[PDB]
Design a protein around this nucleic acid. Sequence first.
DNA 1: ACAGCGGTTGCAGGT
DNA 2: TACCTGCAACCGCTG
Length: 502
Amino acid sequence: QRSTLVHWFRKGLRLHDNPALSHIFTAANAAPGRYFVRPIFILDPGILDWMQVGANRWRFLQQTLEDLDNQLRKLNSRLFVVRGKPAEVFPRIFKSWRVEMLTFETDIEPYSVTRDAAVQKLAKAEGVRVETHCSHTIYNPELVIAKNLGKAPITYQKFLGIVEQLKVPKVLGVPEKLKNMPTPPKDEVEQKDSAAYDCPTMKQLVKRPEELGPNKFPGGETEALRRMEESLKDEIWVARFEKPNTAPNSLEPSTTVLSPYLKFGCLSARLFNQKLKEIIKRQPKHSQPPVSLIGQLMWREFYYTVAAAEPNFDRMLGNVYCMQIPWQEHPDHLEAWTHGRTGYPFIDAIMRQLRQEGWIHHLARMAVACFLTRGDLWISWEEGQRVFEQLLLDQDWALNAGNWMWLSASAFFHQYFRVYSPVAFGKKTDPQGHYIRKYVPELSKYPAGCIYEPWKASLVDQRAYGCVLGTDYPHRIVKHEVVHKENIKRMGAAYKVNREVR
DNA sequence: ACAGCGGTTGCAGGT
DNA sequence: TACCTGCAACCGCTG
Ligand SMILES: Cc1cc2nc3c(=O)[nH]c(=O)nc-3n(C[C@H](O)[C@H](O)[C@H](O)COP(=O)(O)OP(=O)(O)OC[C@H]3O[C@@H](n4cnc5c(N)ncnc54)[C@H](O)[C@@H]3O)c2cc1C
């Protein structure tokens, strides 16, 4: 008959560099036999078949929760995957566990800001001590906005200048092994079913396993650390990394692919930063921001900071940053883009890899995002934002919204006369179309001369390649060489309108 | 005040 | 190779 200390997992699904978790552990061990520890994850079982989460991401979470539990097991504890909505769940477990303290990592997102505040109100209402920590991002956005006179920086170089005069907190290790800790006595839910708070098995989280592609990126802290060290092994590659030089269409990833791990917080962005810094010092010839690997981490920090200031960051309407652009509805052309049936092989190959594997290269993301928006289809960046939210393992509210606005030249980036060619952009790095042959296998017999542009080959040729256009592979839905120039003007028109308000 | 400047990742054509 | 200019000319930041 003791009191309960709760750490609440949401993001930051790791033991390493988790001050919010460490504080629970170091309190408990420094006050032996007076406490029970409940590291919890609150799962809403109602939202398992809501469109905007693909099966691939459900697998990632399932694997992450299973790892987190295995890692907590080693510290003489375990994970508690409590089912229900937080609003219902907390009051019950507050009374039945006799909770003295609650901790969690902060989340700048709106849906969470209001939910956390609602919990934090209830916390005070029940006399439950609450101590939050900022460990998702390297820099706390609210300090960045403050230090820049109550306004989030809208450019990168300004942002770099603001943050490099702020202290970077200590990076922590793994919490203490819990000394003298019996399993917390079974609450009212556990009495009726002992396995009530166990990790959801695949069957439980993944309700639509036919959407599941190859498991190229396993979830969890362990794989996050494994993949990081793997990348940091070639300290030369790390040092001279330049984002634009990385191929969008290489068969194996040209970049680190730590974004899903950074998204869920299986990898501490602080630790990745710290690990990179010491490599920089060891490698005399090394790249500088924005193109550097550390620069990429800073871009994450940049998009986060601006997103904290605007709760309408995911929308055009009501957005302090977003240029107002008269986007047009096209349910047909949206359907084609979403499933990789545009008729542009390069665009299709990327979209198909996204749906199948849940990750695509940044420049590949950039290529398809252009095509949908100002590039060709003139469809809103909010539309592709849904597709990405559904299909990305690294789905990040702030990063997704920020880069879509960057792309469509709604915010941050403005040189709209730079338009990605769905035909040319891919050829540079993949002259043979190995990427297209893999993901759009219909056209795998096509020569490198017209595999990027099948509409250039005759009917006899089409037959000889075993792929007749209109049957085995769609006719291109629009003509890029025509539409992009009309869209360039459409941009300028909207750009003028906007100054006429400012 | 308005103009010069740099700005993660355009394309084509060229050396 | 990894640069070069042309195509039009965008924004925010700085002084
Ligand atoms: C329209 C569009 C939507 C995007 N949506 C997301 C999203 O939902 N979630 C997401 O994590 N990334 C998103 N990206 C940004 C970027 O493409 C990815 O962060 C990157 O491709 C992830 O691969 P990586 O881990 O190998 O990155 P690396 O090149 O290896 O860089 C390492 C880390 O730096 C960070 N980073 C790199 N580029 C960016 C950037 N553009 N903006 C912010 N952080 C960056 C990532 O956290 C990444 O893990 C989007 C890009 C575009 C063009």
